Amino acid sequence: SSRPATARKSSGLSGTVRIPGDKSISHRSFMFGGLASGETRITGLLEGEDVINTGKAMQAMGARIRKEGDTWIIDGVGNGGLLAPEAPLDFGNAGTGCRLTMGLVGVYDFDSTFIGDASLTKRPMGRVLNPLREMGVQVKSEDGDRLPVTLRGPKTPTPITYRVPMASAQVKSAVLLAGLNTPGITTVIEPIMTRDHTEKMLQGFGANLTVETDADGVRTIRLEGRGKLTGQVIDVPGDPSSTAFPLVAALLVPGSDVTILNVLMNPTRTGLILTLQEMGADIEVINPRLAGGEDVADLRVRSSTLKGVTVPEDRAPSMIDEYPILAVAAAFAEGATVMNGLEELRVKESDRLSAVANGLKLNGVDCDEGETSLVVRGRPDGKGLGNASGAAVATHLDHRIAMSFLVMGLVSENPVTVDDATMIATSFPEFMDLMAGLGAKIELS
Numbered sequence: 001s002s003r004p005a006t007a008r009k010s011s012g013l014s015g016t017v018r019i020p021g022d023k024s025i026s027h028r029s030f031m032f033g034g035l036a037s038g039e040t041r042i043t044g045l046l047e048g049e050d051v052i053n054t055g056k057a058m059q060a061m062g063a064r065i066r067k068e069g070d071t072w073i074i075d076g077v078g079n080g081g082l083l084a085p086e087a088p089l090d091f092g093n094a095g096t097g098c099r100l101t102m103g104l105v106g107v108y109d110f111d112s113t114f115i116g117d118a119s120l121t122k123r124p125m126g127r128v129l130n131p132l133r134e135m136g137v138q139v140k141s142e143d144g145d146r147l148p149v150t151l152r153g154p155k156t157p158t159p160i161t162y163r164v165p166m167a168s169a170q171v172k173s174a175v176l177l178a179g180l181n182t183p184g185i186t187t188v189i190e191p192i193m194t195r196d197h198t199e200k201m202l203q204g205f206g207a208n209l210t211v212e213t214d215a216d217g218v219r220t221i222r223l224e225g226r227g228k229l230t231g232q233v234i235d236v237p238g239d240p241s242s243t244a245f246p247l248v249a250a251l252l253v254p255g256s257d258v259t260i261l262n263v264l265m266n267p268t269r270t271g272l273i274l275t276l277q278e279m280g281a282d283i284e285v286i287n288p289r290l291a292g293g294e295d296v297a298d299l300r301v302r303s304s305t306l307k308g309v310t311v312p313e314d315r316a317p318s319m320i321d322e323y324p325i326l327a328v329a330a331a332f333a334e335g336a337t338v339m340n341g342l343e344e345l346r347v348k349e350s351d352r353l354s355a356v357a358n359g360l361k362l363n364g365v366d367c368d369e370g371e372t373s374l375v376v377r378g379r380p381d382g383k384g385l386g387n388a389s390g391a392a393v394a395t396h397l398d399h400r401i402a403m404s405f406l407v408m409g410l411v412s413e414n415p416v417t418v419d420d421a422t423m424i425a426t427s428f429p430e431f432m433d434l435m436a437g438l439g440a441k442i443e444l445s
């Protein structure tokens, strides 16, 4: 059921590796390719479990998906062409696929049921189900608006103007996707910018979607519904969230020099790099270029001495999935690192604020967990950190809790053990091999 793993202090990590594909863009490649008219060809797709589940949900609604050589080829159904699924759409651990698909298919005049694993089933769906109710979708959900959920769209959906209450790219995305099958103009107002893969990719697929940004930063995103979408050639860039693991490991493990190739550098995804640089990290951005319509670069990372910094609440959306690994980096930095505006961490695969704080404490780190913040004081030499008794960090079915603590064990005086490595494959099945190839000592027990 669970498969624990232990990370041990390592000698300098060294090498050059291509990081797996971006999870957010990969989910959307399967969704948009499956919906569009004609053929979509995708290279660099992330083949982690989350993405595969989204692909299976699209196949259940009529898309034909296959892998030829290293390219995934999709024959889409055309906008408005999704077919009623025979059985529930099983998203496993994937909130991105689940929430975006609820918007995509909830507005269709047939029933669709959504289910998932023990982790996804505890997470909030109200943030997307509320706007969908406004568009005319009938919702049946478990108390607290949790899965399983069954949606039934109206014959004619109602377009809406929706101001997203929290900094969620998924809510913005679900409303836009619902708008694709809704007559009229659907508008999403985003007060604080979140990753913009939906907007960029839908424009690439031919959607009449515009983004207007006020000087104060508020984004008004307009989409004309029931328009044609045309299949595209997609080149998926490397995942900057997956990149964070070998990158932080190379900063922390003495004697390290690691280069990660083809990393997505869209600024809505690089808050951690900015933060680590402020902490004194040696991260070189090499050959910045345009690939697949996105900014990418190679990153050369060398061992660095880090100092604690203040990470403001407004930077959170650009690095929300990187707080676990940032907290591990802070555990080896000089002084205190303070991070606020972390409420969203409590509703991820695990309540990440709680899981990170507990994991850090179990491994001897001085930290203070607030309702929406975390303060970490580091021990640069790693002495006294880790857990000599071999006690395991509770991962709570969260791939990043498992990976962040395995990175910690490559630096701490005592080994770090995580209770389960099974969920790492949801976003980074290549993790163990990749890290081992760089010299990391991690053993699956």
Ligand SMILES: O=C(O)C1=C[C@@H](OP(=O)(O)O)[C@@H](O)[C@H](O)C1
Pocket (backbone or CB within 6 Å): 023, 024, 025, 096, 167, 168, 169, 170, 171, 173, 195, 320, 321, 344
């Ligand atoms: O839209 C996306 O691709 C994602 C948005 C984020 O979730 P929220 O919208 O809930 O912030 C992020 O944590 C997730 O891994 C991917």
Ligand SMILES: O=C(O)C[NH2+]CP(=O)(O)O
Pocket (backbone or CB within 6 Å): 093, 094, 095, 096, 097, 241, 321, 348, 349, 400, 427
């Ligand atoms: O990948 C991450 O760090 C968080 N994913 C959240 P989900 O995609 O499950 O909603």
